[PDB]
């Protein structure tokens, strides 16, 4: 005669997580994906009677409502028929086998589940438990659906990555530990949504809106930067990083996200764009939005909505910091994979999201989503942020001379193809560079490209073309470029006119941050070159280590400029940014890596200077190889001395993993190393 009550519940966590593709997270919680059933075993006191029934109630967030679909009340039946459902699969004794399902349109996040029991004309409710519901890229009806297994593994399940960096003259790469499976990372990424400006202002609407990956993606693009909202990372492109980490020293998202949380959600210092993108990639992959990291070389910042940026030099060959716009050696951002119900079926697929604080959008430093397809066709009136993104990959560039001691500027040239090159992302299943420029623009030099350019420009808001120049100029590198060694370049000029010409050349070298921030002059010279018709000449350029050492930043970049002129013709501007090599830093595993077995690693580094290096630190990390971030204090190394440092790691997950290190010291900040390790069962 006892009234119907719940004894206990088996959530079958391990089994359900494997089925839901959530088993990798380091977490004891039940983590599920939306639109997919999960099975529980619920043990009652008595067998059900007629006149008895069970309902489940699920809710998420602080103001759950049925109409906003943040609360659902659904009966234990045989029926499915839309929304949330609970199918009684079998009864055996007082044990019910139950298959519970959520809709493909369910908001993501943390849910509570309760049971409402109808027995003897009574109604009661008991809280059962809590779970996490994520986006479901395995489900054909999910907006984030990604139908290719191998792609899904890369774009959702892979926690080690590669971000392309450097310049058009030398594309390099750094490893990045996404670490979306590491302790507390999924939880921290869910927290982000609970701290945005939108959540603080109107949590009921924010929570309802977490069914939409456009909305989640956009919120993350705001919350990963500190601006406006005390989000994760504070940007710094000044070359002075006092009070924080040099942006280049980070090797992943894990310590950033943990350091944010554990500081009471106060900004982490400091980031540059690949750090924002790395961290945004982690959050996206953790929540189930397939995502990848894009690098655009020669990336324009257009601040005034005309698809053109200006760069300025003085007659002496100094680059000038003038006007708000700029051109970056590279800029990194993200793509997330989802359909766009707001735009129409032709604009689904890859969508640009950018957490780097550049432009305010709707009053906030956020960016995207922008359909990549829509950018390539210049449909820049579509949501979101497409004028700014089109300009990054395809603005025209105008070079100007400016002489402050006349106040005159004059137009030197226009370059319609230099912006937006070698747009790169990590290959699926390897570290190869995949080139995706053709996804963002029609080919440089095609008619399409120029037609797309004018269409886009149309959607928004006198010179004389003098002779072909007599002089053509080019800068070439002579030999090695390595911090600690001299720089040798050659300026090659040629006179293509029929007359003898006398060329006046004014040359400078400035240390720069990779976004084009000028740090300091380190060398300058002038030269006069007499050239016969068709004669080529070389002018050697030499910059000592002593000359650049004090002003070179962790970017290791120097901007070399030569402004060349002959009487009665416009200046010719010759330009090269160089990157100087760090000293070599290697990691090697001294045995084969096996799950759960210690394995010794060795770090080698040779000090190439004639001076000692001090304050030597090695930071190491890699998901599935060690837990968190190891710090090793390395003793002062004498000139030309080598360091040999050994340490154990403890592989926890089989497969191809990535070990990352940073070696910083007084004379060399942020030397990077990366080792792929095969971890066998």
């Amino acid at each position, epitope marked *: 005669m006892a009234a119907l009550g719940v004894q206990s519940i088996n959530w079958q966590t391990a089994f359900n997580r494997q089925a839901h593709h959530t088993d990798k997270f380091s977490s004891q919680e039940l983590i599920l994906r939306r639109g997919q059933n999960f099975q529980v075993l619920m043990i009652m006191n008595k067998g059900l009677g007629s006149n008895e029934r069970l309902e489940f109630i699920v809710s998420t967030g602080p103001y759950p409502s049925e109409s906003a679909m943040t609360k659902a009340v659904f009966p234990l039946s045989n029926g499915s028929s839309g929304g949330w459902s609970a199918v009684l699969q079998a009864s055996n004794g007082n044990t019910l086998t139950i298959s519970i399902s959520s809709p493909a349109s369910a908001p993501i996040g943390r849910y509570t589940m309760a049971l409402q029991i109808f027995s003897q004309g009574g109604i009661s409710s008991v809280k059962l438990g809590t779970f996490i519901l994520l986006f479901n890229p395995w489900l054909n009806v999910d907006s984030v659906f990604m139908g290719n297994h191998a792609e899904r593994e890369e774009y959702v399940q892979e926690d080690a990555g590669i971000i392309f960096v450097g310049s058009t003259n030398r594309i390099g790469m750094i490893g990045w530990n996404f670490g979306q499976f590491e302790e*507390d990372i999924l939880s921290i990424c869910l927290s982000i949504l609970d701290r945005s400006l939108n959540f603080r202002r109107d949590a009921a609407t924010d929570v309802a809106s977490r069914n939409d990956p456009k909305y989640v993606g956009r919120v993350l693009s705001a919350m990963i930067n500190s601006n406006d909202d005390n989000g994760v990372l504070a940007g710094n492109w000044s070359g002075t990083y*006092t*009070g*924080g*980490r040099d942006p280049r020293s980070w090797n992943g998202s894990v310590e950033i996200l943990k*350091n*944010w*949380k*554990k*500081s*009471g959600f*106060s900004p*982490v*210092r*400091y980031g540059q764009c690949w750090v924002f993108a790395g961290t945004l990639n982690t959050a996206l992959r953790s929540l189930g939005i397939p995502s990848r990291v894009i690098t655009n070389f020669n990336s324009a910042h257009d601040t005034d909505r005309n698809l053109s940026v200006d760069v300025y030099y003085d007659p002496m060959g100094n680059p000038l910091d003038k006007g708000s716009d700029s051109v970056w050696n590279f800029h990194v951002w993200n793509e997330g994979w989802f359909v766009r119900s707001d735009l129409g079926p032709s604009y689904g697929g890859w969508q640009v999201l950018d957490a780097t604080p550049q432009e305010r959008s709707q009053g906030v430093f956020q960016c995207g989503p922008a359909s990549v397809i829509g950018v390539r066709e210049g449909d820049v009136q579509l949501n979101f942020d497409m004028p700014f993104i089109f300009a990054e990959v395809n603005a025209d560039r105008i070079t100007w001379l400016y002489d402050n001691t006349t106040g005159k500027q004059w137009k030197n040239s226009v370059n319609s193809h230099t912006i937006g090159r070698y747009i790169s992302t990590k290959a699926v299943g390897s570290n190869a560079r995949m080139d995706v420029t053709d996804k963002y623009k029609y080919p440089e030099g095609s008619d399409q490209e120029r037609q797309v350019f004018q269409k886009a420009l149309g959607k928004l808001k006198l010179e004389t073309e003098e002779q072909e120049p007599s002089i053509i100029g080019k800068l070439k590198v002579a030999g090695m470029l390595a911090v600690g060694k001299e720089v040798n370049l050659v300026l090659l000029l040629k006179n293509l006119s029929r007359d003898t010409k006398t060329v006046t050349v004014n040359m400078t070298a400035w240390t720069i941050i990779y976004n084009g921030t000028l740090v300091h002059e380190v060398w300058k010279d002038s030269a006069t070159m007499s050239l016969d018709p068709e004669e080529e000449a070389e002018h050697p350029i030499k910059i000592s280590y002593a000359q650049y050492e004090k002003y070179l930043k962790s970017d290791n970049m120097i901007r070399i400029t030569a402004v060349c002129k002959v009487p009665d013709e416009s200046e010719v501007v010759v330009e090269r940014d160089i990157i100087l090599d760090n000293p070599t830093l290697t990691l090697e595993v001294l045995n084969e890596a096996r799950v759960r077995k210690p394995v010794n690693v060795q770090m080698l580094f040779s000090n190439p200077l004639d001076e000692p290096v001090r*304050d030597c630190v090695l930071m190491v990390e890699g998901s599935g190889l060690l*837990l*968190g*971030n*190891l*710090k*090793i*204090d390395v003793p002062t190394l004498g000139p030309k001395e080598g360091s040999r440092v050994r340490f154990d790691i403890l592989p926890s997950r089989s497969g191809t993993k990535q070990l990352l290190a940073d070696f910083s010291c007084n004379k060399f900040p942020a030397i990077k190393a990366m080792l792929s390790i095969d971890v066998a069962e």
Partner: antibody
Amino acid sequence: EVQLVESGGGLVQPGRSLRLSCTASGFTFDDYAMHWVRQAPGKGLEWVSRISWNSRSIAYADSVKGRFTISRDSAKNSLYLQMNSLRTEDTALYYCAKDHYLGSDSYGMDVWGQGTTVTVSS
Amino acid sequence: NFMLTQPHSVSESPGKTVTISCTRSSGSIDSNYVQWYQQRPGSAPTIVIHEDNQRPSGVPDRFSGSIDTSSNSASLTISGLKTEDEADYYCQSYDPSNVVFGGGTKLTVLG
């Protein structure tokens, strides 16, 4: 290696003042928060005060608020605690400590000096 | 604000494992990093664990830290105890304002 050397300690009657100094060397001073932590003979550790890397954020324990002032000087790579209206329960060994954390507002004491003795009694 | 509560004393024999708890009185232990320090008579404290469970350069792998959300506590575990491990130990955490220390535990290595 990091060295923290505290000075300015001594004996003083209730009501009077002392100025503690801490010289830092062997790391980049201005990258870190710094702290005073004190220990009374035979007792535990009691945090006294913190000052951010850039001096802009300061915090004090309730038992010293309004009477002690923390400050630092970049050029002198030094940390100070100006203690006014001293009470007998301020008697302790005063440690200077470098914060562990670089680039986040979490707090831990990675290196401690040997301390400077403050004795308050009539 | 919150308190951190440690046992007054623990003991164990040489070669064995001993654990020292540190219970946060309000808010979640997980919210802020925990540090551990060792102090010997006549000496300033030294750090033995930072960031809940990371070991500084120099500290033996016999020392470990952990966190237990269900008891709202942090722990320091020392295995293969040696006589030189006998000392006072302190936990420490913080909120955005204030740094908080545990009251200290005297570890005796039973002789």
